[PDB]
Amino acid sequence: DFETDESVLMRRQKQINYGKNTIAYDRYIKEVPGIHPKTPNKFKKYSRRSWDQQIKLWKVALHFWDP
Amino acid sequence: DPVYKEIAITNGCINRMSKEELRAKLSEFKLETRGVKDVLKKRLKNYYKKQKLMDSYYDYICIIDFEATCEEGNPPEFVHEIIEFPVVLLNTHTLEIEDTFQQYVRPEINTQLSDFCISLTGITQDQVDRADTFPQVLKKVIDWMKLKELGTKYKYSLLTDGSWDMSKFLNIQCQLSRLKYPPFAKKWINIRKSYGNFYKVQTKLTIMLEKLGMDYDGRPHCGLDDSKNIARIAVRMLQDGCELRINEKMHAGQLMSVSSSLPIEGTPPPQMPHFR
RNA sequence: CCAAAGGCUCUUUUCAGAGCCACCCA
Numbered sequence: 026d027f028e029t030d031e032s033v034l035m036r037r038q039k040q041i042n043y044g045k046n047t048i049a050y051d052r053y054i055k056e057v058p059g060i061h062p063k064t065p066n067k068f069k070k071y072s073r074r075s076w077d078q079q080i081k082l083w084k085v086a087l088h089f090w091d092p
Numbered sequence: 093d094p095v096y097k098e099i100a101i102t103n104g105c106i107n108r109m110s111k112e113e114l115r116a117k118l119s120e121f122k123l124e125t126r127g128v129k130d131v132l133k134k135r136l137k138n139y140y141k142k143q144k145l146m147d148s149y150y151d152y153i154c155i156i157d158f159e160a161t162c163e164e165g166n167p168p169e170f171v172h173e174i175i176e177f178p179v180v181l182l183n184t185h186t187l188e189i190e191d192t193f194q195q196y197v198r199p200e201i202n203t204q205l206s207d208f209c210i211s212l213t214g215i216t217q218d219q220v221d222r223a224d225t226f227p228q229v230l231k232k233v234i235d236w237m238k239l240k241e242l243g244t245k246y247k248y249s250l251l252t253d254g255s256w257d258m259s260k261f262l263n264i265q266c267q268l269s270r271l272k273y274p275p276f277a278k279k280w281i282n283i284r285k286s287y288g289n290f291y292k293v294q295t296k297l298t299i300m301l302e303k304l305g306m307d308y309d310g311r312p313h314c315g316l317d318d319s320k321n322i323a324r325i326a327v328r329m330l331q332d333g334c335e336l337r338i339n340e341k342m343h344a345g346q347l348m349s350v351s352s353s354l355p356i357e358g359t360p361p362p363q364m365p366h367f368r
Numbered sequence: 369c370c371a372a373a374g375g376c377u378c379u380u381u382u383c384a385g386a387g388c389c390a391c392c393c394a
Contacts, residue, residue, distance in 0.1 A: 043382055065372090075373035081382090082372075085104065088383050092101065096381035104383030141381090162394040172394065212394070254393040261394085284392070294392045313394080339387095352387060353378095 027068045037067035040080050049090035062086035095144055102140050106133055124331070126305025130291050131332070138333030148356050149335070151246040152190070153281070153326060154237070155180040157253060157318040158261045159215060161199055164208040173199035174265045175215055176315035177229050181240060182251075182323045187330060189323055193236045194316045196223035200268065213313045226269045227367075234362040243276065243361025249338050250280040250359060253297050253322050258340075259347040272365045279341040279350060279357055283322055290334045300325055 028034060041064060044050060053062070065079040106114070114132040119125050121139060125132075156179055160172035179193040196219045205217055223229075242248045252258055258280055266273045284295040293303055297318055301308055306324060310317030326336060338357040341350050350357065 040382090043380065046380090047382090049383090059370095063371090072373055073376050077373095079372050081384090085383050092105070092383075093381085096385090098381090100381040100384035102383095103381075103385080107383075158394090160394055166394065170394085209394080252393085256393045289387075296392065299392090349388065 026070070028070050034067055037065070037076065037080075040077075041065065041067065044080070044084045044087060047084075047087060049087045052090035053087060056090075062089075099141055099144055102144075103137055106136050106140075109133070109136075124328070128293065128303045128305075130293050131304060134291050135332045142333060149247070150184055150249050150356070150358075152240070152242060152248040153182040153184060153251045153323075153336070154242070154248060155182060155251050155319045155323045155326065156257060157315050157322060158257045159213045159313060159315040160261055160265075161202040161205060162209045162212060163206050171201065171268070172261055172264065173197075173202055173268060174226060174261055175199060175205070175209075175220055175223075176213065177226075177233060178315035178319045179233060179236070180316070180319040180323050182326060184330065187327050189320065191240070192316060192320075193233060195229045195232060196220055197226050197229050198223040200225065213315075214311055226265055227271060230271075230274075231364050234364050237362040243359060247356075247358050249336075249357065250277060251283055251322070251326060251336070252280055253283050253318065254295075255282050255285075255340050255347055259342060263342070263345065266365070271367050273342065273345070274363070274365045276360045276362045277342070279338045279359060281336050281338050282340045283326060283336075285339050286329065286334065286336055287325070290329060290332070297321055297325075304328055 044064075062083050065076065065083055071079070111129045111132065114129065114136055115125055118132060118136055123135060123139060127135070158174050159176035160174050162172065163170055174197050177195050177197055181190045181192065182188070183190045196215060198220050205215065205220060210216060240246070250258070258277060262277060263273065284300070287300050288295060291303070298308065298312070301321060301324075304325065306328070308321055310320060312318070329336065337352055338359070339350050339352065341348050
């Protein structure tokens with residue numbers, strides 16, 4: 026079973042948007058896998074600690090198109 | 093503000109540094125170089141933040157660490173009575189211990205200290221036998237704070253290593269002595285909670301000093317000494333740029349957290365509580 | 369699979385910041 030809660034999905038999506046609304050993210054999609062940063066799947070069931078961490082590692086990763 | 097943008101970026105940059113790299117910059121800027129990796133990351137981040145950004149704060153902080161009657165095995169259902177009441181006055185501007193107060197307390201029920209208690213705390217039966225009762229010592233402690241002009245001329249707060257000195261020890265001691273829990277003691281700073289949030293690292297006074305590269309000074313479990321060592325920790329945290337805040341309170345005889353989202357809490361001047 | 373993960377919560381300081389609970393207090 027997956028994540029159904031709308032409020033959780035919405036919060037996660039906003040977090041993802043924060044990452045996608047970066048230019049490193051657009052640099053990424055211009056150019057471009059296994060190391061390529063993959064966007065966290067919001068419908069997946071994850072603990073708060075795990076979801077946030079995945080989002081943290083993902084956002085750091087996208088700056089491979091920055092400092 | 094755009095300058096915070098620049099900070100968040102340097103923060104990430106400091107997040108990826110190794111211990112030596114961290115230890116290197118701090119040395120370079122002539123700052124404290126001791127402490128675990130997390131302590132240093134934090135120390136270095138505040139240096140920048142501080143640099144790239146260029147009171148309402150407490151003038152003094154009273155560090156208090158009670159010692160109480162105890163028993164071997166440390167049973168959960170034990171009725172503790174305070175036997176040592178120390179107070180260490182920390183000047184936040186000067187960042188030095190200005191003065192101290194220490195008194196032993198003679199317990200009314202457990203009149204005889206167990207052997208475990210005597211060896212643990214180092215407080216002897218003679219010291220307690222000739223000591224005063226809690227209400228009397230509380231009176232003297234309050235008169236001492238009044239002489240320091242705490243709450244009137246100076247903004248201050250109580251600070252403890254944990255939440256039991258206030259929520260448990262002083263709490264039941266008041267019940268035993270039959271007096272109302274003192275209002276000036278209802279809110280306080282739990283240094284452990286702060287330390288954990290600030291540096292991101294259980295919590296024993298002994299572990300907090302260690303992760304800071306500090307050595308304990310004095311006899312462990314001597315109320316005054318622990319208090320003095322806790323002050324060394326608070327000083328260091330203030331120097332590492334942490335704004336210590338009253339973060340826990342007593343409400344309905346129940347422990348509750350104080351929101352870090354509220355203006356700096358000023359503690360009322362001390363007043364001897366009434367009986368009943 | 370992997371990766372992530374103590375259970376949670378807030379914020380565009382989001383390459384980031386902040387907090388609650390649990391654990392700890394003689």
